[PDB]
């Protein structure tokens, strides 16, 4: 019924009711729950804790930044040192009882659970958070690719029955070799590729020391947590879309269209929800307005001009405009550059430099004349062209130079020609001109001097004189 | 170099092959260094260096490093002009549909996927899903699913099917299409469908599918995944004075596209809600469509100046587009412009040129001659020598232009006489001097007019100017063949005054030995110019066979007539000069001199005539004064009588005898009668005087009044002008069309008061505005006519045909409108002209009818003849010389390579501004309509026979009572359907009534085979025919205007040709414009070039296909040679516009109008232009296949055949 995308956009965002305070707290709690589940899932990894421990070891030695290690502490290096020492001690205790007392033993399970509880009281920077996420994601993806390659090669029921515990164990290979169904000949032929795949799998499993079930459970838990957090954040932004448009209205007609401003505000708001905190007790609108404002202003400063002006120079121009308006209101006339320089605490030259570079290039279809047919673009010359008389002069100069040099001795004319680069691609200095016959440089210089000496004889220099 | 141009869809691979890199950022230049930014819109790494043989670093800067890549910049060390050729590309994050292949109706995507356009927009606008892969599901491809419906069938099936949104869904649907299976299905349905509308739908879709199959294009290429980027130098960002920069709107559009694409990638990386991604994709689509065509999809984006941005489509299309502003028309060097004065001393081949203007125009030639003769050692010495203006520079300039022709032009150039070649003569001054006799060809008068001058450079151009464009060669009007250099104004006045006759003048009755003695008597004041004398005249006659017979004899004449005979060339009778010479008489003199002596004699005679006319007009002393506007004494009495009887009739109206409308009508009638009588009285008073002869008796003599002489000579003025000067202005009209009751009773001599002047202004403003609008209308009409017939070139000599057109004198009542000689002059007969009542062959076949044979035909009283015509010519391309006949502007048979179509179009379009039963003879009566024929056998009366004193074959004596101009031409040439057309008889059969269905009536007709046809006639129709009557095919059923399509369909080609020719000649003849009918016949041939194939035969032609005619003729010739099933066709009549847009070449059609539709059609079909016509070769800079270049193009098809 409509063709303007703006109206369709408002139709689409108007279908969801507006949220209240309790809804905001509920969504924030869901986001925190998802983050906590993801952190707990990653913490159940033999390679995760050593990385944190060595990062703390480097940080405590006053060699690495403290902010890059952790970002906060959950409360239900005055304090970080004690907590990380406790974490190191518990890691030593767990490594002592990880396998000596038994994997299925209660000691290992209790130690792992309390390690999870301890690690839940931490707020890590998202950078190394995603760094640890990516490694396990890649491991899971490689396991999936190997499993799907095996599935494609073998193709069934026997694999499904033994998938729980013997997915990668050699018992499956032995039982396949023992099987004598009519289709097991090609399966036995493919067993070499399957052996290579499982050999590649052995390195991964010894790196993880979790077999197949444990990594599958960790991946499932992480996926559930991330999906729940994504749903919560998507709901939250879908709610705040109206705040985005309300804030973005105020900065129209600044070179950027309304929909682009709305999209930039949406991106800024997503960034805002990515770091929102509900324990502080402040509502979401106050925090989100700043991020939407910053996104809109950055987008305007970066994408509203044909010739891009850096952000700092944009701020300089804006402050100059504000002070100019204040002075214009105060004295009643346009403030001259010296006065603005004195007010702005900068030299006059900088003020003028700001003044000239604050222009927006004109269009080449601006109607120039009462009749609209004419435009500015058809009154623009091409300054890079060569005048035809100049080209004819160049040709005549080449001919005259050839005529003058033809009355000179072969060696001597060659010396001049291949010193000055006439009728050749490049120019040569005295050394390679000497390397022709007589390697000594001074003879080349003297013969060139003789060339010029005979070339300023009135008998053979009148034609070249007219070209000056 | 190249022989043809193709057009077609661009694949992503092809676009990537064009590109030299990928534009990743909207950056243009640095704000401080003004240098191009990397991976931007102006990147030097992608598009090339900014400086010649340099890179942005400055490390490789000379020509020694040509072709090398700066390893720290990437800028190739080469010329900067590569920035006008190198293109870029943008890898779109999401596919975007092309605006042209979606919104240019019919939507190609729409009818390829057999679904409506609004559905495709709903999918593109991200509102409805489409099922692409149905799988093992009840869903069908192309079925739309709403969002909630989509989730319903997702949760009820899952991954069994695939449903998508946007241009990506359209691309998936188009990529999975099996075109051959679709084509087979359409053919099978076409055979087994009984509805013709459905048949039209399927034939359109099948044509498009087969075009896709044959062209090799793929449907998915209509969706853009890679977007090409124009070279930067074609979208410049250049500095102006004061640091300001000027840019093109394409930069803004490209920046918007790049910004939205990058934001889409950012939103796809940072996982965002689907609503935001959908909005971003909508913005990307909108930006791409705006870049390709702004304003087509919706609201047009505007820049900082609050005006719409102009896109690529706007830059290739329109009046200000590339085709019309830069390709078909250009600004040229070696050109000048100046105000034009009159040179009365010049010859017909000479023009006065300023010295400074020629010095500027001929500068390189002066440099060359100074170098050759040794006055300058180099070219800079010559430059300073010319700038200092030495005398030998003037001598060099004199010798340069000694025999260098120059082209003079005046805008507008309505016909080819608007540009002519002259020999320059240097004059000290600033204005171009123009020969008076060419002014009528230029429509130029010296009130401030300006003319342009062009200098041909090469020898071929100079010889073309000297042979074809020289003013001496073009002294005949190509439209009608009449001379165009006829004298006017002061020449006519002088020749009239010198040849007038006076009673009792000095030297009356004297005997003179010859014209020399007459001149001697005039110079010695013995005899006046108007004295009646007897002169011995020696007169030579050149007959038709060339016999030269000289007779000397005594002739009664005047002194001035003998002195004028002094300059008449030998070979003409003295009777041409022994009369008072108005404009018509001088035109007859020039025509006779051309017809019996040639071209050089005609030019010399014209020059001498204009010299003598100017001289004796100066010697006459003719002056206009206030006493020459004599007002008859009868005007006052007649006005008094009219006013008194107006009072009487008003008093009678107050008595109620007659109504108001009758009173208005009769008051108008009496005022018209009074105006006519006053004009007659003024003319009688002004046109004569009383003199005293030698005997003393008062005698009646023609008046020597200045205004009377001006009007009677034809120099300037008419009877109406004199009527408003000295009689009554008359009745003027209220500006809605109504005539005011009271007229203007005062002429301009006595003067008008306020209201009379106000009424005059009422009509004056209307006249000015009508001229202003009609000029533009005529220009548009002549553009259309030029483009429809631009392809017509004389390609052969004899086409070997036997067809022809029968011509008779035109009769529109009891008198002739045009003689047979006028119509048959310059044509070629098709069959032998047999003498009536005899079997002898008076005129053989393939003979040109000149004046001699025209007189023969007139003497032997031939009523109907038949001659070859252009429309009946059967040449594959163009026409032949015999079917065209004489070249009017040359006088001989038309040469091969003549662009007869352009000449025809210009001839028709030039006079556009000038545009807005009792027997009377003795003979026999014949019935067919009623015809009355004299005893000689010429049918001289044609009369209608509504459904009579004499029966058929009965002799009738004399007196026996047997009982909006230019719109019309445009409508006739556009073949416009009348609002209430006349219903015609489809076939010869008996009429009968039918069931009168509510709303409108039906009638039935029974054919000779017993088949019954039903015709649908509206209620409000006067029905003429009666039941039980066998009406022949083409008989009128309901009266009204006849549609040209119907007469073509039912009656024939000759019928529609005759209809169009007669109507156009009628409208042009009401205004007194002479135009030959072969031009109209050429236009009609261009109107008949398509055909609907009815019987398909087996040559690959779908039934109902609008193929072009000569292809069918050639295919039928090959089929006959193979003896295998031929084809049958019905010829259509298309207007000049539709015929122009239906031409084979897409370059000409694109340059004409509707560039977007033509380009879309050609690109989808994959057309190929072979550059056979004038316009395409003009655009690509090659020689036109007409005239001097014609033979050249012939050699090309001598090479391509071998
Ligand atoms: Mg004028
Ligand atoms: Zn470089
Ligand atoms: Zn012919």
Curated annotation (Swiss-Prot), chain B:
It comes from the Bacteria. One of its GO terms (biological process) is DNA-templated transcription. Zn(2+) 1 binds at residues 55, 57, 70, 73. It catalyses: RNA(n) + a ribonucleoside 5'-triphosphate = RNA(n+1) + diphosphate. Mg(2+) binds at residues 445, 447, 449. Its cofactor is Mg(2+); Zn(2+). The keyword ATP-binding does not apply. Keywords: DNA-directed RNA polymerase, Magnesium, Metal-binding, Nucleotidyltransferase, Transcription, Transferase, Zinc. Its EC number is 2.7.7.6. Pfam families: RNA_pol_Rpb1_1, RNA_pol_Rpb1_2, RNA_pol_Rpb1_3, RNA_pol_Rpb1_4, RNA_pol_Rpb1_5. GO terms for molecular function: DNA binding; DNA-directed RNA polymerase activity; magnesium ion binding; zinc ion binding. InterPro entries: DNA-dir_RpoC_beta_prime, DNA-dir_RpoC_beta_prime_bact, RNA_pol_asu, RNA_pol_N, RNA_pol_Rpb1_1, RNA_pol_Rpb1_3, RNA_pol_Rpb1_3_sf, RNA_pol_Rpb1_4. SMART domains: RPOLA_N (SM00663). Belongs to the RNA polymerase beta' chain family. The RNAP catalytic core consists of 2 alpha, 1 beta, 1 beta' and 1 omega subunit. When a sigma factor is associated with the core the holoenzyme is formed, which can initiate transcription. DNA-dependent RNA polymerase catalyzes the transcription of DNA into RNA using the four ribonucleoside triphosphates as substrates. This is DNA-directed RNA polymerase subunit beta'. It comes from Vibrio cholerae serotype O1 (strain ATCC 39541 / Classical Ogawa 395 / O395). The gene is rpoC.
